Design a binder for this molecule. Structure first.
Ligand SMILES: NC(=O)c1ccc[n+]([C@@H]2O[C@H](COP(=O)([O-])OP(=O)(O)OC[C@H]3O[C@@H](n4cnc5c(N)ncnc54)[C@H](O)[C@@H]3O)[C@@H](O)[C@H]2O)c1
Ligand SMILES: [Zn+2]
Length: 325
């Protein structure tokens, strides 16, 4: 073909805003193909009073996207969808979108995967153990270390640990894990974001980075040794820093990415600064995968209230990465 192979969009939890966000792509010229139930997409468009012409995907049709059309790779829900109403019978459908999306991108049929939001509890309620797309894709591709990084114009925040109960965070953090996470972060910033010598600022685990060992020992026993190892590999880390002020910039503390030890240590600030522009990108897979930075927003499904800014940013980032692959 002439144009790039299209981006594949998993439409996510069907009762949530994922379908709505995919329908918002119909008015763009972004080269996207939607994985989802075609009847669902048509019915959601009707509920939203949108006039969209749907095409079924074919590899023998043009990769150039035209406004007003939406190309779909149909995957059938087990049961018809009611907006805002979770149905555990459709959890396997969601997992099929993830599995088919990973597989089709792995084979090069599509140039990148973008994920609309999924409802984790609904998947688990159906009997499918699931902590997030990030771990699902790591397992699918048999990659030991992947990194969740949220990115916006204000900042990039990578996580050492992702979806864990807070009780499990300290035991999950080892020096080796920090090293492997930051090695992947450094590699991606240099090779995929064009940052020649990344500067990475790293939070401590404990308040005030453990208060010189008086408020937890993990900085002394785990984090600082890991950062020393990374420095001696030539990776320009600074830390451990207190998370409550690390995100405040000054004339000298500039960095290319922050590392937070756990989910709620880093994501609240990032989403406060850039919720409607930020992208969740998974580092370390053999495919490009980006994501919205928000959840299913079930109460907004079918209501024309959700902001498509994160989805649009996620598609554009995936496109930019695919063009520079
Ligand atoms: N990438 C993903 O698949 C992903 C990411 C985050 C959360 N989730 C899942 O989503 C479900 C809901 O969790 P939550 O309630 O913590 O997250 P959420 O983002 O669904 O809701 C948080 C708040 O943000 C609002 N919101 C979310 N997206 C919005 C948008 N595009 N425009 C306007 N307002 C928006 C919601 O109305 C709500 O007030 C959970 O199952 C969670 O695991 C999935
Ligand atoms: Zn989360």
């Amino acid at each position: 073909h002439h144009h790039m192979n299209p981006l594949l969009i998993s439409s996510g939890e069907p009762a949530g805003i994922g379908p709505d966000l995919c329908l918002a792509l119909a008015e763009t010229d972004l080269p996207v193909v939607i994985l989802g139930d075609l009847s669902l997409l048509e019915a959601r468009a009707s509920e939203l009073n949108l006039s969209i012409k749907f095409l079924e995907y074919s590899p023998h049709q043009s990769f150039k996207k035209k406004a007003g059309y939406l190309t779909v790779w149909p995957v059938p829900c087990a049961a018809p969808v009611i907006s805002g109403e979770l149905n555990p019978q459709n959890a396997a459908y969601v997992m099929e979108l993830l599995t088919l999306g990973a597989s089709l991108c792995s084979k090069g049929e599509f140039s990148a995967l973008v994920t609309a939001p999924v409802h984790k509890a609904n998947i688990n309620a159906a009997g499918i153990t699931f902590t997030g797309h990030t771990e699902f894709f790591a397992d699918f591709f048999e990659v030991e270390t992947v990194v969740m990084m949220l990115a916006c114009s204000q900042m990039k925040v990578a996580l050492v640990t992702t979806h864990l109960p807070l009780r499990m965070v300290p035991d999950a953090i080892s020096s080796l894990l920090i090293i492997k996470v930051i090695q992947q972060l450094h590699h991606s910033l240099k090779h995929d974001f064009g940052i020649q010598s990344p500067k990475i600022n790293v939070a401590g685990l404990n308040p005030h980075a453990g208060e010189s060992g008086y408020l937890g020992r993990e900085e002394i026993e785990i984090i600082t040794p890991a950062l020393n190892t990374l420095k001696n590999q030539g990776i320009d880390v600074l830390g451990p820093l207190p998370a409550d002020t690390m995100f405040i910039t000054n004339h000298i503390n500039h960095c290319d990415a922050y590392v937070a030890m756990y989910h709620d240590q880093g994501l609240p600030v990032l989403k406060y600064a850039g919720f409607n522009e930020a992208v969740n990108i998974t580092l370390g897979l053999p495919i490009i995968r980006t994501s919205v930075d928000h959840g299913t927003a079930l109460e907004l499904a079918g209501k024309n209230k959700a902001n498509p800014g994160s989805m649009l940013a996620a598609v554009k980032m995936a496109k930019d990465m695919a063009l520079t692959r």
